[PDB]
Amino acid sequence: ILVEGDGIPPPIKSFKEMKFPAAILRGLKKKGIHHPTPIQIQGIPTILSGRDMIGIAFTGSGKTLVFTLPVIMFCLEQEKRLPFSKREGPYGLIICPSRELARQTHGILEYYCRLLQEDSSPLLRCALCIGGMSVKEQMETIRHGVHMMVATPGRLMDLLQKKMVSLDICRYLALDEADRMIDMGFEGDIRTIFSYFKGQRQTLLFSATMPKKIQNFAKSALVKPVTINVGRAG
Structure with a gap:
């Protein structure tokens, strides 16, 4: 694994030390997920710190937990502090390419x-x-x-x-x-969606590849991200 950026939060080697609620830890075990993968070990602490993140990773790397478990934790804290009203939200949004992935x-x-x-x-x-x-x-x-x-x-x-x-x-x-x-074909739609934010956001971008068009996209989309690259092998 390769990590780039300033101020990189240290990696954490177990789910328990990442401070997930017990119900989450129990559910990971029920899914047969016992130990974190490399992108989880480095990526979850990055997301929990509030930094933007580029994950160069694909299906099989365990990327999905990186961007789903933190947002559940953030939403849980928000709902405790002030229960969401009718018509409020979303607080967290995940955008993906296909109906089956969504x-x-x-x-x-x-x-x-x-x-x-x-x-x-x-x-x-x-x-x-x-x-x-x-x-x-x-x-x-x-x-x-x-x-x-x-x-x-x-x-x-x-x-x-x-x-x-x-x-x-x-x-x-x-x-x-x-x-x-x-x-x-969705670059324009995604860029337009970003302009619908009235205020600041934490942005996470996951991609198996990183050609120039995506490098330029990420430069525009994110702010001082930490990049985590699992590598072509891992």
């Missing part, structure tokens, strides 16, 4: 959120904003307020234009497969 990530979020609620946390609310859903479905969930939203870029753009969603309290934005999303 569904998968959303289900991961709801899994951990269910585990937390079975252990006397509040129930956090997670929205899926993709194609093949009606105005009806989407409007419904956003009516109750949303902690976390998982979206594909064209659908999110539609919702933002129609003022059905607002990014006014969104403080966390993760881009999963940013290379794939730009190759598929």
Whole structure:
């Protein structure tokens, strides 16, 4: 693994020392996840410190936990401090290239959120904003307020234009497969989405590749990120 940037938070070698709630630790074990992977060991402390992050990583590296477990922890703290109102949120947004990936990530979020609620946390609310859903479905969930939203870029753009969603309290934005999303034509939509932020945000970008178009994108999207590169082998 290769890490670049100033002020790199030290790596943490176990999930327990990363301070996840017990319900999360129990759920990792139920999923057979016992020890962290290299991008988790270095990436989770980076995200928990509040820094922006570039993860050069692909499926199999354990990237998904890097960008899903911190945002659940942040939302849980926020919901305790001040319960979310109807029409409030999202606080955290994950954008990905495909319906099947968004569904998968959303289900991961709801899994951990269910585990937390079975252990006397509040129930956090997670929205899926993709194609093949009606105005009806989407409007419904956003009516109750949303902690976390998982979206594909064209659908999110539609919702933002129609003022059905607002990014006014969104403080966390993760881009999963940013290379794939730009190759598929969504650069403009993603860049436009960033301009819907009225205030500051922590931005995470995950990509298996890093060609010049993506290097330039990341320069525009992120601020002083820590880069973590798992390597072509790992």
